[PDB]
Structure 1
Amino acid sequence: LSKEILEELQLNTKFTEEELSSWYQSFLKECPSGRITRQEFQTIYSKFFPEADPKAYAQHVFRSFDANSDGTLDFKEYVIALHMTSAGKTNQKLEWAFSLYDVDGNGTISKNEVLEIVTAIFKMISPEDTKHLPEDENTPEKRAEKIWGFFGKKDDDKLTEKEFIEGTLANKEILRLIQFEP
């Protein structure tokens, strides 16, 4: 690691520098490069969520962090990705839920895009639990809709980042929706 990346990581986690270091060493033993590939990263999720199709979701999470598209996530970005994938910190989290959702990366979210992640996210719910799901929103096609709803202005065209951070922050109903299993 590097001193700066050790703190950007410790001031984004309840992880100690000492821990982030032991971690690195372990990570480096599997990726001597100090960087991890989408292929590899995807496996991480297929392993710990055997009861679903994490493949899709994982790929999206991956794209959301691999900034300057090298097809690889390095330790730092990789770490903060394993985070905004579990639960907890949610603002430091929703300031990323936009990145995950603005799939094509421009600067605005579409109805398809919302539906693409809602579905990918859905494919992660063990079929078992797929049922304990509040019917109004218990299928991809639905939830996507019970979301593009709150953001009103059903443009069936666009949703800027302003309206996203506001709707998410304002009403915590969409926040619960748009986001994964915390």
Structure 2
Amino acid sequence: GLEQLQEQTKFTRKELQVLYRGFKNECPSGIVNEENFKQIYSQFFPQGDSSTYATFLFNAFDTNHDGSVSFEDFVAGLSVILRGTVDDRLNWAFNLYDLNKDGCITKEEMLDIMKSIYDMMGKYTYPALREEAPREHVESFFQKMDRNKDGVVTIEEFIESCQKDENIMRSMQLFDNVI
């Protein structure tokens, strides 16, 4: 319903109407299966491959573990990102990174996501292209965002370590301007 969505999400009514018209225009009532999601991303990322990261966050948006994403699944996830607090965005990010949803990220779990994002740049990168370089990026991340020093980052580990920074905090306010 339009009213229950008016109250569940931080959106106004006209912003809900615009989003619903667009959503249903792109996939009418065959709401989305995990394959059409990736085909929808494929329009925004030429020169690269986006299917793996698309699959990675399709399960983040799928709150229940059904095979499909509805409109409330879509719009609740958009509201928790575009209208929520910085802590809510960070919780969403961490829950995306943590694969098995246990509460801790190991080097394999985030290595997979780093490979996924790197695949999106595509065939040719203007500087060199390596694999131990994504390993180095994972290493720099675990350097910047861990006090456990056990090669494992946790929910509070990521929350309190990701807040102290400056440039990423100026970044994570990008999602408030244009909506």
Q: Hey, what does 1:139 align to over in structure 2?
A: 133
Secondary structure in 2 matching 1:115? helix
Which residue of 1 is the match for residue 52 of structure 2?
A: 56
Contact 2:94 2:155 in 1 (8 A): yes
**Stretch deviating more after TM superposition (75-84 or 119-128):** 75-84
Aligned to 1:3: 3
Contact 2:81 2:89 in 1 (8 A): no
Residue identity opposite 1:155 in structure 2: D
After superposition, give the CA deviation of every residue in 1:117-174 in whole Å (9 maximum; x if it has no partner): 12211222355556399x9xx9321111111112143423x3220111111112346x
The alignment yields a C-alpha RMSD, in angstroms, of 3.4
What is the TM-score of this pair, normalised by structure 2? 0.74
Preserved contact between residue 42 and residue 51 of structure 2 (Cα < 8 Å):
yes
Q: Identify the residue that residue 31 of structure 1 maps to in structure 2.
A: 28
Q: Residue type matched to 2:140 in 1?
A: K
In the superposition, relative to structure 1, how do residues 40 and 6 fare at CA in structure 2: closer, same or farther (>3 Å)?
A: farther
Q: Which runs of 5+ in 2 are unaligned?
A: none
User: 1:44: Cα distance to partner?
Assistant: 1.2
Identify the residue that residue 171 of structure 1 maps to in structure 2.
165
TM-score w.r.t. the length of structure 1 is 0.73
Using the TM superposition, give the Cα deviation of residue 25 of structure 1 relative to its aligned residue in structure 2, in angstroms. 3.2
Distance 1:38 1:81, change over 3 A: farther
Q: CA deviation at 1:84?
A: 8.3
The aligned length equals 166
Q: In structure 2, what is the equivalent of residue 160 of structure 1?
A: 154
Looking at structure 2, the residues matched to 102 and 43 of structure 1 have their Cα atoms a distance apart, in angstroms, of: 24
Which residue does 1:100 correspond to in 2?
96
User: Residues of 2 paired with 1:100 and 1:119: CA distance?
Assistant: 14
C-alpha change, 1:102 and 1:139, in structure 2 (3 Å) is: same
Deviation at 1:93, TM superposition (A): 2.2
What CA distance in whole angstroms lies between the structure 2 residues aligned with 1:102 and 1:172? 23
Separation in structure 2 between the aligned mates of residue 47 and residue 26 of structure 1, nearest angstrom:
15
Counterpart code for 1:164: F
Identical residues among aligned pairs (%): 30
Structure 1 residue 18 corresponds to structure 2 residue 9: no
Deviation at 1:28, TM superposition (A): 2.7
CA distance in 2, matches of 1:129, 1:92: 33
Deviates more, 1:107-116 or 1:164-173: 164-173
- SS of the counterpart of 2:89? coil
Q: Which amino acid aligns with 1:68?
A: N
Q: Report the Cα distance in structure 2 between the residues aligned to 1:119 and 1:149, rounded to whole angstroms.
A: 18
Structure 1 CA distance for aligned equivalents of residues 77 and 46 of structure 2 = 19
Instruction: After TM superposition, give the deviation of residue 66 of structure 1 in Å.
Output: 0.7
Q: 1:19 to 1:129 in 2, by over 3 A?
A: farther
2:165 corresponds to which letter in structure 1? N
